[PDB]
Ligand binder design. Structure first.
Ligand SMILES: COc1cnc(O[C@@H]2C[C@@H](C(=O)N[C@]3(C(=O)NS(=O)(=O)C4CC4)C[C@H]3C(F)F)N(C(=O)[C@@H](NC(=O)OC(C)(C)C)C(C)(C)C)C2)c2cc(Cl)ccc12
Ligand SMILES: [Zn+2]
Length: 193
């Protein structure tokens, strides 16, 4: 069964918003065939498997997501199922060639410590960088709020990609910090055989 795009999050205007593009009745048939003729748009895709939903971000012409979500699955497309270009189980990283219409985010180079996490609801949460792959939430949020948001981007104030949200540093149901795949790790993945 293929991963299916069910929505999108637009990050290029003055407003971050989500738009749902697929219901439940179509997801299952689209998953079995891997054929989805719906048009793609935006930097972030809301994707689903059998019973789980998460995010996928376009960076350097690749649509990236978490392995813990996608596994080795193909993604549904107008021509049929698309096989992964990249997979790093140790990094929890998967990638397919970006679909037509998906705009890629720019990798951040200003080395900002002030970061913004993008949720599946297109809510933008401020994060302070605490290392290469860690950031603390300025306002701690319960774990329940962050569920279904892995694969989404960490952005700098200029709106460039800093990382991909992978895990939360949880203490008694509260997420105090977030673990992310740095954008320099994605660049290493695209360069190595
Ligand atoms: C294949 O490799 C891997 C697979 N899986 C990994 O992590 C899994 C998935 C990830 C998760 O739930 N993702 C979220 C998520 O939203 N997932 S999802 O979209 O719901 C998914 C089910 C579709 C963003 C979370 C959200 F819940 F907050 N995990 C945690 O957030 C855990 N915290 C944790 O481990 O924090 C550290 C790292 C500090 C110990 C808690 C305790 C919350 C379960 C556990 C890998 C992590 C790393 Cl670093 C490297 C490789 C990994
Ligand atoms: Zn930047």
């Amino acid at each position: 069964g293929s991963v299916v795009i069910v929505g999108r999050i637009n990050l290029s205007g003055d407003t971050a918003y989500a738009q749902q593009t697929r219901g439940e009745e179509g997801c299952q048939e689209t998953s079995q065939t891997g054929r989805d003729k719906n048009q793609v748009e935006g930097e972030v895709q809301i994707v689903s498997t059998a019973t789980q939903t998460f995010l996928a971000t376009s960076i350097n012409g690749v649509l990236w997501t978490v392995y813990h979500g996608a596994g080795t699955r193909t993604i549904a497309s107008p021509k049929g199922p698309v096989t992964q270009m990249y997979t790093n189980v140790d990094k929890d990283l998967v990638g397919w060639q970006a679909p037509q219409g998906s705009r890629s985010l720019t990798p951040c180079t200003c080395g900002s410590s002030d970061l913004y996490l993008v949720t599946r609801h297109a809510d933008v949460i401020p994060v302070r960088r605490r290392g290469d792959s860690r950031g603390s939430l300025l306002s701690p949020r319960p774990i329940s709020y962050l569920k279904g948001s892995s694969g989404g981007p960490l952005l700098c104030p200029a709106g460039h990609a800093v990382g991909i949200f992978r895990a939360a540093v949880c203490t008694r149901g509260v997420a105090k910090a977030v673990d992310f795949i740095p954008v320099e790790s994605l660049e290493t993945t695209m360069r190595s055989p």
